[PDB]
Known about the structure:
The complex is a heterotrimer of chains A (275), B (10) and C (100). Chain A is an alpha+beta fold. Chain A has four helices and 17 strands. In chain A, the strands form three sheets. Chain A has an eight-stranded antiparallel β-sheet with strand order 4-3-2-1-5-6-7-8. In chain A, strands 9, 10, 13, 14 and 15 form a five-stranded antiparallel β-sheet that branches. Chain A has a four-stranded antiparallel β-sheet with strand order 12-11-16-17, with no helix packed on it. One nickel (II) ion is lined by residues 1, 3, 105, 180 of chain A.
Amino acid sequence: GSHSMRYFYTSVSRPGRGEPRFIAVGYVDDTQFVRFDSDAASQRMEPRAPWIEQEGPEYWDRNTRNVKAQSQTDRVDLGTLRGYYNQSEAGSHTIQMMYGCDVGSDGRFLRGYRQDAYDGKDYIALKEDLRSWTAADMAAQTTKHKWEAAHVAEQWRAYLEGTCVEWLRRYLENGKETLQRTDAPKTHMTHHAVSDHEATLRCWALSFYPAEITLTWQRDGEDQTQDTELVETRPAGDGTFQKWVAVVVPSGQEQRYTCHVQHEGLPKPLTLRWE
Amino acid sequence: ETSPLTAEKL
Amino acid sequence: MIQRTPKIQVYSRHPAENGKSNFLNCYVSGFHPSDIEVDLLKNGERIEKVEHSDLSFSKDWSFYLLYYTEFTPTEKDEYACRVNHVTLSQPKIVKWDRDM
Ligand SMILES: [Co+2]
Ligand code: NI
Ligand code: NI
C-alpha cells in the first residue's frame, strides 16, 4: 500500500561519569532494519533485516557517521537544556527524536516528519508544511529562531522529500518479498468459564503484519463495548503482531456474539462466532 | 538512510 | 514528564501446549522515564538467558521493550515477568497465563 520510513533516537544522560546512552532504531513500516546502541561494542550502525545486509561499506560508514554526530549533538543539547531549565547535575534527562517520510503506492512523497522531545514532552517539531516549526516552550522558541537563521527546515524538507523517499523506495524493492507482503491475522476464539453461568469469549488475532488492526465485538449484529476488554497490540518477536478482544457473556448465549476483524491483509473483514 | 542533519539546539 | 508506570503483558509467542517448545515474552510499554529492570522468572527464579529489543517509543514519547527467551510450558512450572521501575515501590510480578 502506502509505506513509511522512520528513525527513532533516544539519548539518556549519565550523571556522574561519561557520555549519554544513545540508541537509534530504523523502521520501514513495522519492520526494524537497523540499530545503533552506544553501549554495544561495534560502535557501528548494524543490520537488523536481511534485505539491508547487501548495502555496501560506504552505506554503513555514512550511516554510522550520521548517528554518531547526532549522539554528540544530543550530549551538547542535554547540557544546554539542563542549563536553560536550571536543573541540577544530579538527575538523568532524555532527548528523543522521530523523523521520516511516507510514500504512496506509486512511490510518491506523501508526508514528512521531524519531531523531538526533552524529558518526554514535545520540544520542537517541523510542521507538515516542512517550512515552519512548532516550539512548545521558550527554550524551543530560542531553538526555533536559531534554526530559522540557519536554514534548518529547508535542509530537513530536502532530506524528507528527497533522500528519505528515494531510499524508502529502494528498501521496498530490495525487501519486497517481506515488506510488500501482508500477513493476514490467523484468528480463533477461546472460551473461559468465569462461573457456572457466564463465560469469557476471547477473539484472537495472531501472526499478522503490519500491526494496524481492528477487533470488535457485535451482539445481535451491533457493536458492543460494555463488558469487553481490548489488549494493546503486542509483538510476537518473529516480526509479526498479536491482539485479542474479549467479552463476558451469559452462558448459553454465545451464538449472539460475533467478533469482527479488519486488517490490510483481509480483502473483506472476517467474522468469527463460538461453535 | 539516516539524516545527516545534526544542528545543536541552543 | 509525569512518571508513568509500565503496562505489562506476559505471553507466549505461539499458542501454548504443555511439553512443546515456545518463547516466553514480557512486553513493557507506556513507561517514563526509560530506565527499567525486567526479568523473566521460572518458579520464582530469574531466567539467565533473556534477550531484549532495542529501546523505542510511541507517538506519546513513552517507551516500550520486549524481553524474551525460549521456554517449554508445562503443567507444573510457573512463569512470570518481574518489573522494577521508579513508579513501583517494589518489583511488580505478573504471572504468565496462557489464555492471555
Ligand atoms: Co519525567
Ligand atoms: Ni505498497
Ligand atoms: Ni522572538
